[PDB]
Structure formats: structure tokens, C-alpha cells
From a paper:
The rHev b 8 and rZea m 12 crystals (5 mg/mL) were obtained using the conditions described in the materials and methods section. These crystals diffracted to resolutions of 1.9 and 2.2 Å, respectively, and belonged to the P43212 space group. A backbone alignment of the two 3D-structures reveals that they adopt the same conformation, with a root-mean-square-deviation (rmsd) of 0.27 Å. The sequence alignment shows that the principal differences are between residues 37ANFPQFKSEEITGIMSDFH55for rHev b 8 and 37ENFPELKPEEVAGMIKDFD55 for rZea m 12. These residues are structurally located in a region exposed to the solvent, mainly in the loop that connects β-strand 2 and α-helix 2, but some also belong to α-helix 2. The assays showed that mAb 2F5 specifically recognizes monomeric rHev b 8, even at a low concentration (2 μg/mL); conversely, mAb 2F5 showed no reactivity towards monomeric rZea m 12, suggesting that this [name] recognizes a conformational epitope on the surface of rHev b 8 that is not shared with rZea m 12. Interestingly, the flexible loop and α-helix 2 do not participate in the establishment of the rHev b 8 dimer interface and the competitive ELISAs between monomeric and dimeric rHev b 8 confirmed that this region is exposed for interaction with mAb 2F5. However, between the monomeric and dimeric forms of both allergens we observed a significant difference in the [name] binding (P < 0.001), which suggests that the monomer has additional [name] epitopes in the region that establishes the homodimer interface. When the cells were stimulated with monomeric rHev b 8 using the same and two fold the concentration of the dimer (130 and 260 nM, respectively) the release of β-hexosaminidase reached near half of the homodimer, and the positive controls responses P < 0.001.
Residue numbers in the entry: 1 to 131
Write the structure that this text describes.
Amino acid sequence: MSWQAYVDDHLMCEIEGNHLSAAAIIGQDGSVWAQSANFPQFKSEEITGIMSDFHEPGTLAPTGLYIGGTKYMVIQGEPGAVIRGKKGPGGVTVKKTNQALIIGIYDEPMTPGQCNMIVERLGDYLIDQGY
């Protein structure tokens, strides 16, 4: 398995007829492991902001979750494990692994639940592989 294969075939594949708009596997230092064509470049402090929220859940919500300069409202996630964001009919799921981040960005008609499922299920599988 390449990381590009995990992105192309396991994150960017169909789920219930829908597809993520973009996806990435990113080291917690901010190093891209692999990403899709339209996944944005992270801006400064963005990865740091994400990790601080995993470390202290609730830190990010007041100011918002930023990815590629796009602001998402933080909605309910899983403390220290999953960050979820909403932006109108779109949003994002960030799933923490031991040393990486699995990220999916969706837009209508794809649902939050579909994005959560495809992103979080791969994260759990990669965690059990020691990643």
C-alpha cells in the first residue's frame, strides 16, 4: 500500500453513491503523506491549532477550525480522537491516528455521516496498523 492508494481508493471512493470533495493523510507535524487533487495547502498555525484541540478538547471551537484558510464551525466530535466542522451544506472530518491525521472534506449532496464514516473507519484501521 502507498499512501496515495489509501487516499485514492479508500478515501476518495464512493460511499452510498457520494464522494468526498477532497481528502488527505497528513503527519501531525504537517508533512503531507498523500492528498487528493483539490485538497488545500495548510496555512501556518492550522495544524498546530488542530493538534492543540486534540490535546485539550474545546480549544478550537471559540475561534473556529481553519483548513486552507477556510473557516469551519466546530460541531460535536470525539474528545482527543475526532474533530468535525461544518460550513453551510459542506464540512470536514479530522480523525487522529497515533502520528497522522485523516481528513475528508465534503459538500452536498454528501452527508456529514458519510464523511464521518469514510474518514473515521480508515483512521481506525490505520491505528490498528500502528499508524
